[PDB]
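Schema walkthrough. Field components (list of strings):
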Amino acid sequence: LLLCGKETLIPVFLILFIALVGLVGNGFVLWLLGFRMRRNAFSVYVLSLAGADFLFLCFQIINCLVYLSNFFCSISINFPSFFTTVMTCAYLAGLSMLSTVSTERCLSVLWPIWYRCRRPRHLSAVVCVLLWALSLLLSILEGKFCGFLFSDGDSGWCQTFDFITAAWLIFLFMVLCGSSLALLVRILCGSRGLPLTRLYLTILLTVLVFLLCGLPFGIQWFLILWIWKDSDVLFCHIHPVSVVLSSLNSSANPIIYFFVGSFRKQW
Amino acid sequence: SELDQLRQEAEQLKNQIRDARKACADATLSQITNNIDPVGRIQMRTRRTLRGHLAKIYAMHWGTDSRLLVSASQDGKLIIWDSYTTNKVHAIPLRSSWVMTCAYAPSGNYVACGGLDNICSIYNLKTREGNVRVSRELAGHTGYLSCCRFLDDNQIVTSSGDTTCALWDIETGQQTTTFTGHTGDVMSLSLAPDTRLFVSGACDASAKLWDVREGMCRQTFTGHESDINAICFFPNGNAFATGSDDATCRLFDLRADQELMTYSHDNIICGITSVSFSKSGRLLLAGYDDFNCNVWDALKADRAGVLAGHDNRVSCLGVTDDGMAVATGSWDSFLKIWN
Amino acid sequence: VQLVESGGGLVQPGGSRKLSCSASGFAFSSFGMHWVRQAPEKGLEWVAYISSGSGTIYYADTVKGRFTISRDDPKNTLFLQMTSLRSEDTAMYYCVRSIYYYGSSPFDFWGQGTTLTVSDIVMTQATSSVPVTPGESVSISCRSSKSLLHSNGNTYLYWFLQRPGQSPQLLIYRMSNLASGVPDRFSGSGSGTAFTLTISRLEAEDVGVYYCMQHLEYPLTFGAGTKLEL
Amino acid sequence: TLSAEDKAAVERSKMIDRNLREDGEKAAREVKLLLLGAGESGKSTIVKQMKITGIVETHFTFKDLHFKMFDVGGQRSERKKWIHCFEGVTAIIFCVALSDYDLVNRMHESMKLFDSICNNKWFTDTSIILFLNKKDLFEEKIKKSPLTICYPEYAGSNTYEEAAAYIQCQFEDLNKRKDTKEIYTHFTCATDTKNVQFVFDAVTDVIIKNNLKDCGLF
Amino acid sequence: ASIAQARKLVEQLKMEANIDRIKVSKAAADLMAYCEAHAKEDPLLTPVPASENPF
Ligand SMILES: CNCCc1ccc(OC)c(Cc2cc(CCNC)cc(Cc3cc(CCNC)ccc3OC)c2OC)c1
Ligand SMILES: CC(C)CCC[C@@H](C)[C@H]1CC[C@H]2[C@@H]3CC=C4C[C@@H](O)CC[C@]4(C)[C@H]3CC[C@]12C
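Field assembly_structure (string):
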């Protein structure tokens, strides 16, 4: 982030503000569900999503503080290269939990009697640890083949599996859009008892959060730096605004997915 | 007509009773206990939380050892909890889910529960086979049970929504005394410390003092303008407290045969689901359905404390025989034990 | 309530044998099982313990590795697979039910025992034989090597009576509480590491060997055996 | 610390917790229908059509779904004291006899019961499945007797369909919150196998709404 | 018919009337004297220290 410096500074203050308020939200949600409240099977997904956003936002505090030490106080803190790898593991597991929440709401409306009765109880845990394992595996093998894990790696596999991780994000985007689409078709064709306006606003709100906040940092970290072949003229403009957008996603995920979902009883 | 002059004699008897009992009203309990220092702020923190029920709890009861407590909820479970170690000693499944009362025998060998099935079922806890089984089902009482309470291991008094209370013999299974005289549904029951008399509070906004031996109403008490849900003797066996849906508790004394004190506050407009006294009877702990409990100073009618740890209606509460703890069950499936 | 065991007999040393115990008339899955053996002219020696629902399994240090205790709850049966038997495993083996909750009475029912013939905290019952006249009062003391009073207030001392030709039988659990089917003439008292069983107004069918056992920690250890004679 | 018996007590308490979670997730995957209505209104016809002393419980299975109907009307007391026990039923199966309009103001008494149950604070969003019973009796009775003696403001043809739709419109208009809960009006024959299908189809909407509440989406 | 129930209610009020009622000054005095005589034995009026508290 030291490539341009002066052109990124008020984004870095928005990183520290938005990531601090999202860290308070994710930690408070994690303590509420894991310890205090009673967990239903959707709360496993909210829990793993809050953990992924917890890791992502605290690593963005770390990458914010390295630039804050270098620009103001002039101490070159060399926080190591595997922080980027577990940051990307947090990012991909957060997006996979977003797509999995959308798929689960689609399955609860499309097959509601299977979801009430024949659904296995630990299916949320199996899906959470399997997609966390695939997120961690793709992130560490990307870090292994690009030099973020112990300083070795060839570029001809690095762009090849950066493209595979970006294909995983566009697959997650079409799973989220197709699940929200099938959910909205099955409701707006055949509902009787549901409040359709709040449901419409919440479903399109989650789709626009995944589109305009989460996916840009992934497509600029896994596609745009290999296709647009520019490293200096545009990277200083599009990298911190993408980190602003995905930090905004990881901050605003618990206020949508838990606080609207539970604390309407306050007001 | 003969029925009209008979009703004239009835209202003349009621007028003579009201004049004879205001003739013994010389000084209120507020006027006697105004020089008494108050108890200050009663700060009671939640010491245990018992978390095993998955539905609304309507009844708890303490053991006489002040350590075991039985708890009844709508998932068809009554759990006997160890209150000290927070353990579950027994989980007894119920033949009907709809259970609104539970009691624990003073010997400790039996629990008994009842509800919309019209039956107080009695469960023997201490069996050589190792499980809990049903010993008796006391059928034939033609309304939902609101409160059953043990006297011995062989006698139990039930109250119901057929406007009657009853005394049962457990081993024969047949009720031996029927206490009739309320006109509304009898909602609560409390036995005296000598267990030779008891009170029943009902939906006609009147509490009646019964007499277990000969089987008939000794005194009758009015003053509430709404239906009484809770009742509790004072530890002396001379006074009792009523709680109802007009947001007031009331204290009555049996020898003075009238009202003494109204525990009311204009902030409280909600109903009362449970009352109990402390061991000395200075604190009256009323559970309300604005989701908390109040601790009233029972001699001065100050509100000394608030037990505010539940997220639904406080439906049942009970103080130990030691006085070391207060448990409070509620509709959000959690017992809280306070001290 | 009946525990009847089978599977005993003669085993050549080095061999193997499975002991089985069938339960009848109690809720067998709610109960922890113990195997407690007894050598031909010695005292009771605890062997193995499987919990209710098999969640916790303990063994004695002299049998650990070679013995396996395994319950099966639909058949209401208990097994002890015994591998590479030595000549000190010649014993009579007793199945014991024991249930653990607040106020419970563990070790309360014992089986009839099978005869195997192969071809910590210590308890000292200091008196091995007491001359008894019927009608009188007999106090029987035993020593521990550790304070049996726990922090919760329970002092886990268990008094058993083995009448001759029979199985032992629980008299007192946790130094002071009478078992069901035990008269009030038996009483127990003590402090940590010093306990006594008093029998006021002794009658017949109290003749037998009295064992005191600790349940503070595993392995469970019995006394050597105080014997009454008439 | 814990002694050797307190560890086994805690292990017993944990195994009791596992049996409690098994039984609670077994009862949570089940539809609880509160059967209501005035007396002599074909509730016996309903409980012989779904399947074939205070509270009567009926268990039946239909399309991989377990239903428990609670007929609580066998016991008579003050209903407000025990009606909060059924807060959290999936649906209220109300039964109204159509051919009980000319008898004694019984239809006005069942409208009083429907106004009490439907505008109750405990069933403020509970869906109601309304079964209008004895419709063949209503067909043969409406020719000789008019609907004026039950509903004096009724102006229409004295056939089955307009007056039956009028009785529906009166029963739909007892609620004060039309946006909050749903009312599913049906007509039972003397004998037809489609009433449990109507119950299942109305329960599927409540199951969809509860699944959406479960997933935070409401 | 109903006059038997009305005579039952008149006999209930008739035994209800003839009862020895003490004055409520004596009654309130006995309630206040019980609450003073057992005030040191109440572990909710006075806070108990954590030694003999089992919670
Ligand atoms: C001007 N050069 C100064 C150095 C400089 C410039 C810009 C820059 O941020 C983009 C970085 C950081 C950086 C960022 C990524 C993120 C995308 N993949 C996860 C990857 C690498 C590895 C890497 C990239 C390329 C082609 C990238 N084409 C733009 C070739 C070989 C290579 O390592 C074998 C990086 O370098 C360590 C460094
Ligand atoms: C297998 C490896 C990759 C998993 C380790 C990932 C780490 C970071 C943690 C963070 C939060 C954790 C989750 C928190 C909540 C639960 C709910 C529980 O009922 C199942 C496990 C599950 C779902 C945990 C799985 C592991 C988890 C996702």
